[model samples]
Target chain A: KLKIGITCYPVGGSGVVGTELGKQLAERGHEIHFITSGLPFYPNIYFHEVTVNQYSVFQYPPYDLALASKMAEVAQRENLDILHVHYAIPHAICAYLAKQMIGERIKIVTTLHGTDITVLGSDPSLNNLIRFGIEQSDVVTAVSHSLINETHELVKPNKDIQTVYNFIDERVYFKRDMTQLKKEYGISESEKILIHISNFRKVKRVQDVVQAFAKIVTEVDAKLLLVGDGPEFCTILQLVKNLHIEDRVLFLGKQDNVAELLAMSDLMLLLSEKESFGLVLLEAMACGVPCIGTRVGGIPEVIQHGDTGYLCEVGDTTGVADQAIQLLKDEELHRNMGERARESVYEQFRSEKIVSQYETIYYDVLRDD
Target chain B: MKLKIGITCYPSVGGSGVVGTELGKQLAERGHEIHFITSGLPFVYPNIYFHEVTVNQYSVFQYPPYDLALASKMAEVAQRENLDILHVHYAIPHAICAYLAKQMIGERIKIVTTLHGTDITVLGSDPSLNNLIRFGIEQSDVVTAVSHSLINETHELVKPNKDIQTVYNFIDERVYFKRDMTQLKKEYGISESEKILIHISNFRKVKRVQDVVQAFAKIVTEVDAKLLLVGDGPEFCTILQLVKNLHIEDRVLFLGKQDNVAELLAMSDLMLLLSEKESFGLVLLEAMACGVPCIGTRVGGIPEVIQHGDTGYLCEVGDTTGVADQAIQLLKDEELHRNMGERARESVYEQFRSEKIVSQYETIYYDVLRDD
Candidate 1:
């Protein structure tokens, strides 16, 4: 029965990993403290030993420093055994500095989500600090093997960094009846719906997904659903208009009911240039929806080529379109890939399976004495 | 027109900071632009006289990190002032900091670094910094050492492939002259019958201030003496107890930390500096310039400063009885003590004048700018 502090930063893969890890660990007699500037997930839980603390943010507060200090205070006061902070840029660095006040009594485990590397890796001054923070960590982990390789390529941290693929909550992400929701969207039963969910950032290459979808729509009876809102939403919307595929494309902006949308979809497309593990692809995979994502980062790990989904190089619009058209043309091939996708999610990427892997890493870090 | 220059080292009362700020002061006199890029005002120089020397202070963030903030200001000033060469003292952080600044504003400023002491010997000796220390050195255009002994030690320990030359330490005769401040003798409640023995340090563990106290305890009985303990550090309480245990509390004065130390040096008849791992005792020259001879340990550039019997005395570390015996001899034979002080000042003047050392730096700048 270990006590853990989960620190998240609304970080991409970090947000999902931290929130789910807390509840899953709590179920098996571990005490969890969800500490952050704000929780970006559901917060109405009443689980035992799952305490929540929220730190306030001022307009111009040095929140990273403030967050670090708060973690130190919480860890010292609550006697938290581990501070598992997600993301490398700020949280890892923050947790490393925070432990200085309370000394070695608390162990630090920093989980590196993708953006902390792909975004902050190019920043010259920050990379060294990130490297130092990772070295300072008692145990450092990346979300996928690809992220571990990318972090090694970018940060050049002295210590060995490990990989831990993320898990999805099965309660919210199982295949269900989406007939009402599909009819509500007017996506038609005969039409194959290609779904792409993300924060729609440029790194996600949402335009690549749209361009690939435009090609498949002309060749097959299909409708593209771009889920989520971000800085790139208007640009993708304008591209849909420019392609004259407005009637075939649907922009479902900012979703909490994403599982139902994933359930109704025939295939999921994630053509990101950099993805640690496409958590959205895994969620779609859990709903028996085979994915055709760009062969980058941990996407292949989530979607095994020819088994769960098809993979192609980034910016290959024709290749992605060809894969999409082939999946829609043969319903039997699509169904078989969809079944493999569901079984893979159940076997490897379930909440219990990946959460146990995290528990083992925690024990490895804590057993030094 | 003057050449734009930037200088950085520790900004405290240590050996390296004294050399760097004094070098900056001398370079300013030669119509060269001097910028002190550091965390604080270098305590060695007064702000009023350094009107030509620009001190770009790095206001720290909440972590109060010196390395990152100082490097940011370094890049900013190099691009802003168009600095020709930035001379950094001590390699670990400062040399690495210059690498960061050069990467930020490439090819504009040439970094000329000088190796001082502990950054190579103590901190850089850590296993993690082998690659980091080499990177800092290889990034610099030129590297120099304060002493020849230090040059040998750097090659043996750090072993960076960069070429390093030797540049001896120098004292500024202008401010470090002996003063006729006879009232300071009375202001601190010392009588004319007693000889003043002063020891100054930050009092870290390696300094062994208790050795000074132990040696002083034995010398006080043979000759009438007043020991002035200058500066503060971690071992202050222990040092106070050692003096009190000897029942000579009245004879020892805790000056805490002092400013305008030349005035304090003028009242002293002897300076006792015994450090185990010092690269150079800049304070030894500062005291010598005030006509005060020292009995320093025979370690790390101290032998080059003290000429054993001529300038002052030298003792192996923890040779307490020998230190006490030397102290008694210098105190009893007043004629020998007076001549040693005079010879010490001449020794400081002949070799360590500010002009000689700054000229060496000017030549280094000349070579870097010429190459460009």
Candidate 2:
């Protein structure tokens, strides 16, 4: 029965994570409204049920202020009951300005993603503006418990912070129709496949993915699947040529069918030092692929050390290789871990549970209790 | 320990300047170092000459950005004087300037913003400047509004996260009290047969001066009275046109910018104020302290100042006919007028003596420093 306005920012990692949440919530029968500077990179791919409201941008008027005008206009036209924004800096402040123009009755929910906290929070001039957005929001929720704690310690807002884990739909991410993909990519039957999917940003530590694979192939017969594209893509390619392991490593840059790539994998490795939630770990888990993530942030929460897959500290290339080799060598142990990881996603991070948890937050903020 | 305090507000003839200069005067008597970070000396301060008061200018000669220069001057004064508290009397240019200065200084400077009437009921709802207003309020360490109604109105309009309390505007009893020896009706060309009706304001649109003119026109035919229009503003010529259209220019005298309001009030019969919006109606209280009853609208804090049927009458904003009726009733009933004047003076002394109101500000200064 709630009318929600979901905000989007196309420039970062959570751009897709936010659109997926809104798409699933709309499919579940609640009305969803989308407002942003423009269409996010992925609003119409694979699903489309929400209404979108976009603002035009010109350099004559500043970008952020124009976005604020359109946000206020949409909130007034739609009579929105709630405003849920993804990033904190531009979008959170945009929604706060809109709430002032319209009435204060509309509850503002801010979800902190990665760079807005880790990168922008360090700037001294933006500290006051960030604090304004947090203090003005009716309720603030982070994607991971670690992110929530980090925000409170850094921003010190007047409101309490809540944790709402991210979820992916099982219909798209579950293990499906990827059996023939192994032969299509020309991998031998005896060699196992290991995959790494990310935006290839420096904080993702994409070089560690290659270094860990270099040591793992010494002990096990495996092919590394590097599935992403960014500024680090060429450096990682030159690194593959320098290490002279170009035959076994496949550069599948910027894939669209990530679920199949995750399904054909024997193991998934993500060694990011700045991830707030390690969302790829959940995507791989939904496809029944066990993940070996770093112990940096929410990774340890996603991949249970010996139950789901394994966890290694950042820069521990040897331990990452040892874990990957141990899991690939024992077929029965890898199958059991992948099955448990998929089941864990179903029980602990169901899409229905997160949607209802958001509904409860919306209801409580409206009640002001 | 003696605390150094900085006082800032617009220096003009208004309720904010009255309360602000009086506050600085009273705090100086209590041995607090008072620095007026003002544009010039307040119009009343030079003549009334209180000891322990220093006049420091906020000299921003030409400002492509006028507000920034004020903040820079505040920073220069605060850093040099080691000011313990900065109490700004209005928000628009004062509190925002103080906020920027506090940011320029360290956390050593604490800002206290006092909300006078028009800045909230008049300018607080404007969205473009409303954000700037909220920013200034949220950055303040403590805030005081002149009345509880002004505080409520501010929260509803500006909607800031800062906590604002009521400090209640007061007047100098030594000036506004009822006086007996003022039969100087001839000073302003008032005939002995005429009853004096006074209206004081900046004559803005929100003050609803046209309604006052119409109501006075209706009452002049029923009673022998003369209208005294005090102060000047954008609506001054418009009000003059209204009187010329009403053809009562001979009876209604336009007393442009008079300073001796208490002496004028002692010779007047009633105060007619018809503002559509007011925060505290400090002018009505000033009239009340001079034992002059008012017939003002039931807007904002006007009802809080002028008690209905006892001290004066209350009507809706456009009720010119009803106001004319109330003015006629107050003129005919001699016993009610004399009793209401006595009670008006007594109420102002009992509730808002300058000593009690200024002591509250002194406590706020110490509490801000104590809690720090």
Candidate 3:
């Protein structure tokens, strides 16, 4: 087992992936050192704090440079064989800087987690810098094929980028016994439950979920569950009110028990305009809930269109309502699809499989050198 | 037998843009072919070519990709013009872009980054861009800051692990030297005996123009003097109010903004630059070139420019009384004033002359070229 250093902006989906991967590697008896700007909340891992000197002359603290210095410091002291960084902008750049400072060879593996390329890569100011980060890395991986395509289109780096699908921790994310909890929420046994989970941003198109649910409730006896909050929370709330489906819809604001929530959900709708990997689809699928997502981004790559779930054009609320109605009406088809969705997670996105894929990549890069 | 040089700087009325534009003009005059790769026109001279960088704003980008476009332009110009050195002013995006261009063009072309003040003092303190700043500085073949104080501050704030040379800002000797503006001085209705005390700045809060007015109030009480406030900024109204409150409104001339700064300095008896932070104090050099001794705050590069009691005097920031006392001594003692003025002129000629500073830059360019 080799020593590994990981750097990630510990906040969102990518951060979770980084932490989960590190924990998995640690469990595999590899020394996991996190060279992050803050304490990444995990046990059994070496933590290196990257502190920024907030000098008076600067309005913004230079955390990127500090992170690079810390990575170099930790890599030298720990004799880390790999510097695994999530995102290309600052993390990959910082990792590249650290590698140059270190005397010995330390492989840099960069993971493009959607926004860094989709959002920041489009920016002219950052395009070259991000390209440099990508080209300099010994190995580069993106979370989804869509991200890989976008990275090539925007950054156009003279480097090969591998696609590594995001995974769910089977221990916490599998379908839990939610029969008792369903009664507490007054979720009737006969009533079909539909769920949509997101940060409620405009890009998430949560209003379409509410609008489609308004149509689905009329055709079938069902309740819609809206999970999470963001800038579009109040707007989605008003849209639900305007649709006069307040009684039929449940607004669950920012939940920690996502597995149980997904278990209770009969069908999941993720109608986002721009979804990179649709990792939420994986979470829902792990709970044996077939997902209906937009045809945009990596949703098509995840949902399998007609096999596990259906894909609809973005803003096609009627199409979503029709798909939801057909699945809710037929018990056999829904059960068969749910079982396939659950089995597909095991075959494609098993935690052990994905983590082992990363392990193999680490060993492969080390072997190449 | 001159090298082709590519330069990039912000096009503006003051600050590093002016210095950069002046440097390009001076370099062009000395027979080097100058290619200015910028977004705007920098007042043209012979042998100087302008390549405007236009960032094609795509729908995907939230902000214009000016930096990348500039890098592309620099690479294109360097390839097309066979530029030996790409001298970029400011460390933020320009130096970073130059580094990118060099990466695209290979090691044959060299990058030289010059830090003016704000890029290091203001932006370097920011944690987000400091690494980019450090990267730009470290990657560049040669780096220079306007003052030793600025260079020291860059090391403290940025910690780039790169040696940055100090290149003091210069003035055009032909335009800035003492001129007989007696007829123009009379156009402003000034008596020959009235001592002209001048202060030129962008009138920003850091300039502390009110301190100049307060000190001028004290000087006019003892010595027959008039305060000439040149340039305009956010602090103009406040400084003008202070001048009126001190009842020195009749003795103070609010010139607002004028093109004939060197002519104004030629007729002036003393120059006052009481700023809290001044990197290089280019205006002091301009005044000194016109045979006018200056009194400045002992901050940043002010101490380096004014030799205490030799050429001019240095006071702590907000020391209006000390500034006034020095002004009184210089205005009262005609022999001492003349001697300081003469020394100030000679110092500028020896240290900050255009040819001397320009030649230093050329030496750096050739040395980096000699590397290959």
Candidate 4:
């Protein structure tokens, strides 16, 4: 079994992608070790803890240097054959330093996460470091095709960056009985349930979800469930309280049962400022639920407009609310759209099929090496 | 009118603290209000005020905190006090800290660096801290050296494109001037006919106190004299054992760390300071100001201050016979002793007066601040 090291910041999408890749690689009889700051949600995988501290812009600690030192230590101690890193600015730079310290034999693979390409990678101060990281890697990958294009625009488009769409275990999120979920949220059998989940950062524009839900509440008997809390949590909560829709709107701060909640919901609403790839939308589609998301970043690559779900402008709260109301009130239209969403996931987004494509890419990289 | 000035230096007892305390007292004589920023009170002066930095749970770093991150916190405290200027003693880390503080305070507050011995002689040659020292020197608005020898050493070590002027250490003439010899001579129980020889130092290995004692024993054998060994260090016990073994304990008086050095210098007929290295040898000059002729080794800037045979004698480092011969020559005639003491004070008044040297620093400050 060839030893592989997977490094990523252990939070949100980077954590999910790193752990899932390690699980898949281990199942295929390869030795894998996941290196991150803390324990990820996935068990049964070997984990090496890497501690890092972030500083404010005014006083930046040597976090990049610390991460680079830790990466080099892990690579030497574990005798890793391949280093697969997620996020470009820090992780990719750390991987490059680790490879240089370890020698030329160990291969370094970097996967560009969303903000590393969309936000920080494009910053003037970080552009050169990002370019150096990309050029030093043995192979590069992007989560979506749109991200590949975004990264090319930020840096040079010379290196080949393969697209590896995220995967979900269909068995974990397939259709479940709505009786338990509906009773838990105090919704009746006939009431339509609309769900939205995010970190509630200002960039997510979670207030737009509440404004959209108010319109849906006006048209039909419905309840809105908002998940996750961040800097904008209190503002969004105060907005919902002031609208006098506190009973109809529930703010479930950071729920772990998002997949189960998606199974019981009528539709998933994602009104973000931008997204590299809407992983939540794909997860909802796998559970026979349609999605309505903003047409920015990689959301368009995940959701087919007017087919599986709908797309609207980022700030178009009225348009999103009108579309949600139309879908919830018409049962015939909802059923047809939900069927197409489920079929789309089964055909193009199954974990078994998506993992095979990854294995093929791995074999191609090995053959080229 | 006296200028209200702020002084920053290492609180530990070393060259920086000694020079800073002496200068502050002299400036207090000129009616300037001195504010000292240190971890503790360095010296007692009536007009000088001390500000202690408060340590909290987050202050888990080194004292006189060297990190650039603490610069803004230092600047906040300085701005609140509305101080005139910050005179950072060391150049490598302290100058960098002042530069960081200046970025927060803008162009109002001025920063001056006093390059002491090692920050140029030793640390400037170290590869790891060399580049950082260069950056720190470049950031300071004005740079001063303790001696002209140190200025040439800094130029050779850092090759800094910035100009630096020499500001020699100044002594309070009223405090260190000649005092009554009868009380100190009777206290040490010296015979009226025997000559007195003294050596004062921290007794560190670099100070070479054993060499001083060996040379003293040789001088006493040739001349009727007594040795007064002042100060303390790690090698104090070892030197005491050597004195006892050499059968010179009765003749050698080990007065460890005397607070009244000027009174001790008054009783001393001849001062023998055989240090292997010194920046400016402040103690040698202080002894000279008290009408006591000095014989020090020719190292560092000792020759620059001590005129050979005119003010004091200079011998090669590790030459105990040469130092003993000079001590014998100075003690043979009372006429030669009085003449050398008068010339020594004249040399200090001509070259090392605060009125003359402080103006050199002022000119450098204005020139550096005016440069782009």
Candidate 5:
């Protein structure tokens, strides 16, 4: 087993994937050294917290310097085989400098999560540094093929990037009988359920989800469930009120029991205008729930259109509503689609499958070196 | 038009502080209303106003917000004084603070950022601050570096993609001309026959104080010369111990940090600036302005300031043998020293005269102001 170091942003899909990877790597008996500004979720693995000092001369605390220093210190002491950082802005650069400081044999593996490339990477001020960070890493991986294409187009780094799809633990994500949970939420069996989970940001296109559900409910008796909260919540709430679908809609502000909610959902709508990978779709599909998403970004990559789930063009709420009506109207079609989605999760994005892919990559890099 | 302007800079006795304060005085003399927004007092002159920015050390805060406090003061001064431009001296907190101040005043006042050495060379390597520094540069109306070398380094490191021009530092000719200080030279115990070599710096490790002491040891062996060390810092005791160990303590005088440097420069026959990394070598310009030839290392902007074999000599860093050998050749040959010193003075007056450089700054200010 190889000793590994992981650094990632502390929120959103990237953080979850890093945390899960660390835990899985540790369970496989490889020593995991998780370096972050704060403590990691898993307790059995090693935790190296990077602390920042606020000196009077500096306007902002130099977290990146502290992080690089900590990474060097930990890598030297631990003799880490790899430093797998999940973002490009600061973490990849920090690892690059840390390797420079130690002059170590430790290989750096950087994973490009969406925002660091899609949003901040396009900025001219940060583009060069991001490219340097990507080019300096021994191996770079992107969450989806779409993110890799964007990284090449925008940042333009001279590095080969592998596409490593996100995974789900079948232990926590398998379908459960949550009929009592549905009844408690007033989601009757006679009324089909449509759900969307996101941070409620504008790019999530949550308004389009509500607009489609407003039309879907006209044909099929359904209740729209929006999970999570963000800046766009009030606007989505206002749209739901304007459509007069308040009684048919359940504004579940923020949720922690996501698998149980996915189990309660008959059809999951992920109509984000931009997504590297619709991770929530993977979670919902893992729970035997069919999904419909916009055909933008990595949504088409995740949903095998017309089989496991349906893909509609971005902002085409009428097509999304029509697709949802067909799946909700026919129970046999929904059941077969949901089964195929659950089977696809085990086939492609199983935790064991993706974890071994990373292990093999670690061995491949170590062997080549 | 006598336009009102404000300035902000770090209140140190460094190259940037001297440049900002001197530029403010020059602008004031040109009939422009000048305001200095800083944490402490700068030089006093007519038509130049000083505005102090103070931060409260409240018990609740772990770190005092000096940047925000500076922004608030800059905003207040710009709005009240009707300032046209806020020229800030470094990109980090000063330029970012100016950006914040202009944002508060509805972008009515323009900002000009100047990039010095350390902010780009040292701090720019860290990824945590690259974005903030880039933002400060991109938001400025115009940006300038102290030298073309600095401009190239800034583009390679920070990569703001902003066009940065070079504006060389200048010395006030009235204060930095040749003068007769025979009595002051006599008081320092240097006889009329002895040649005087002076080195001024903050005595930091990057200045390579030990190399200066070592090079001086070799120089004194060849020529009858006295080494005058100026300024104090963390490395003072280490340098002093090294000087004593070399047994050259008597011949080396430690004149820790003094004002009226022009008098000291006038008395010296040669100036030494053997630093590992120097931005513009402001001291070299001052010494050259006083008709004293200098020997500096071939690093940073020192090459741009001193022309080898013409104005002065340039040695590689840590090459004390080469530095000492060059110093001996120049000091022993009186004819070579006098001609090089005169050429050094002429070069400073022609290329880096205060009026010419200050007028360049005025043109930048008017150009930025004329756009809107």
Candidate 6:
């Protein structure tokens, strides 16, 4: 069995990617080892716990050193065949160091999972280290095509970066019963449902979701379901309470059943400042829900404007609400848009078909190296 | 008046812990309460209390942050116990932690820092951590170095304005006396005719252990001898591999890490120490106390201990062949060996006895407290 080591932050988006990849690899009968601090979502795989501490120089914790030392120890003991590190700064740097310590027999792979390339990776202070990490890896892949382009622009364009779109389990979206979900959320037969789910970070611009929904509520007898919570949760909660639309708006904070919620909704809203792949928008589309998202990063790649859903300027809340009301008022247009949205996701973004592309890339990497 | 002192140092089997534990036991005999705050009890002593630092979830991260939380916890314990002084060995993380605790406690507990080898020489050389280490040293009420050379080296490297006292590393004469040669010789399967040469170090690259092997090879050819290589480190496997390749595995015995170094030194005829740099060669002094002469290289404070031809010999750096010749000359003459061994033990007893050195520390501690 080929031993593969995966490293990522043990929480949030990176955690989800690491755990999901581990599960997928385990199902394929590969010897998957997940290296992180504390417990991750995947319990069945071989888990290597690394101790992360702050060194004297840096303000935040230097996760790279902890991961690097742990990776070195594990490679020495276990003789791992390959190491795939997620994130750029320290993970990639540590992976390179581990590769050096473990010698040339072991291969290193790095996947750029946003922020590392788009934000911190571009900083002059971390540029050289980021370049070293990318250059040392045997294979490099970015989560989206836009991210791949951005990576080339930020670093050297000559450095090759392949694009691999993210995947969600199609079965979860397909099996969700919309009728039961609508009934549970207490939606009337005639009223349209508009839904939005995000971590509510400043980047997500969740305030725009409330502004857009206010206009939608004025246009149609519809309710907005705002799911998930973050730093902006209280601010948005106070805004909704002050707007006197608390009765029309439902705040369902951070739920796992996102696919079910999307299936019951007539339209999905995402007005983010920037998106590498906009995986949530793709998920909503896959659940037969048309999306109205800001025209930023890879959001346009997932949602076909005027075909699957509408695309508006990031800060254009009035335009987003007008599009939502137009779709909700015409039942025939809404049904056609929803069918096209589901078809577009199934045709381009199905997990089984997309994961096969990853298998092919991995096979190519191993064969060449 | 008897003072309740809290001792904080590495609980691992090292020079600092050995001295700290022995001193605590001796102070307990003098009717003072000794409390140890460490990960675990390194050495056992009667009438001494050990408070284990509770291992919590937060310690899993990187250096300064991990120790910052521990420092706050240490401050809480010091205030609760009404500790008189907090003596910390190794300056970087622990001393920096103590400085943080000092801010929280506001001079309630006096802080003293002892600069060990790597904390000043190796780790402090890094530009990233140098300022933090310098700040930590400057904030402490009293700073001490194990040797004069180490004290000078720290001043040159970090250039801190604070004065660092040179306190020679001491050993308890009662515990480290010469053992019976006949018993140790029989245990190691060596005869009286064959000279036994020993080298003890952590086997790090800085120790240059391969030079020790090369020196011993030259000595063995000159006189019938065996080399006892003790301790373990990152270079252990590589050195073992080298020994196997040279086909001299039988002649060189790898004893790994030894708890009873005094007994090991008692059986040996000569000790070889060929280090690139050392803050202080505590092993050389320990071997000398066991009536075994040392042929150490002129690095750090080896010259301060080995009085060339009187007690032992000292050679220039990387002079393996010259060191081996000295070892051979000493081993061949029985009269010279007897005289030098006697003088070696006498020198250690006069210079590095714990009773004399502990008084120096007590004076420093009381002076710092008095000034406050």
Q: Which candidate gets the maximum DockQ versus the true structure?
A: 3
Please give me the total number of clashing residue pairs in predicted model 2: 0
> Candidate 3 residues A9-57, lDDT tens each?
6647668788889888888888899888766574558787676654332
Each candidate structure's TM-score, on Cα atoms with residue i matched to residue i, is: 0.55, 0.51, 0.75, 0.53, 0.56, 0.55
- Which is the leading candidate under TM-score? 3
When summed lDDT is taken over every stretch of 10 residues in candidate 5 chain B, the lowest stretch is: B56-65
Model 6 segments more than 4 A misplaced: A1-369, B58-66, B181-184, B245-247
* lDDT of every predicted structure (CA atoms): 0.77, 0.76, 0.81, 0.73, 0.82, 0.75
Structure candidate 6, residue pairs in collision? A52-B60, A52-B61, A52-B62, A53-B61, A53-B62, A54-B62, A54-B63, A228-A254
If you score just chain A, what TM-score does every candidate get? 0.90, 0.90, 0.95, 0.89, 0.95, 0.88
Location of the lowest summed lDDT over 10 successive residues in candidate 2 chain B: B54-63
TM-score of chain B of each: 0.91, 0.92, 0.92, 0.87, 0.96, 0.94
Better of 2 and 5 by lDDT: 5
lDDT of 5 by residue, A1-369 (tens): 788998876556678788888889888888888898765475458887676643323545656655766888788878888999987766776687677656666898988877777666553434555776788889888889998888888878888899988896677887888788579887775788888887677878887889888788888888888898888878988998887779888788798877888888888888888888877888888889999888888777789987799988889988888898888878788899999988988898979889898889888888863
lDDT by residue (tens digit), candidate 4, A278-331? 778878888899889999889988889877989999988889988988888788
Candidate 4 — which residues are off by over 4 angstroms? A41-45, A51-66, A156-158, B1-372
Deviation in angstroms for B88 in model 2? Answer: 19
What class would a CAPRI assessor give candidate 6's docking?
Answer: incorrect
- lDDT digits (tens) for residues B115-181 of candidate 3: 9877887777765556567777988889988889998889898899799997878877888766777
Which structure is stronger by TM-score: 1 or 4? 1
Error of 2 at A342 (Å): 1.2
lDDT (10s digit) by residue, model 1, range A63-140: 444465567667877898898988776567557655765667889888887777776666554456667678789999
Q: Write the per-residue lDDT of candidate 1 for residues B1-372, one digit (tens) a residue.
A: 468888887656666777888788888777887888875666644331221212222111222334554565677777767888888986666776676667556567888888887667664564434445665676689898888778777778778778888888887787777677767788878856558899977677788898899999888987789999988867888888899999999999999888878888888889998787777767898899988989998888888889997999999998887888898899789899989999999888787777777888898789777746
Task: Output DockQ, candidate 5.
Answer: 0.02
Residues B20-89 of candidate 5: C-alpha lDDT, one tens digit per residue? 8889899999999999998677544558878877554222222344555576678778878889999999
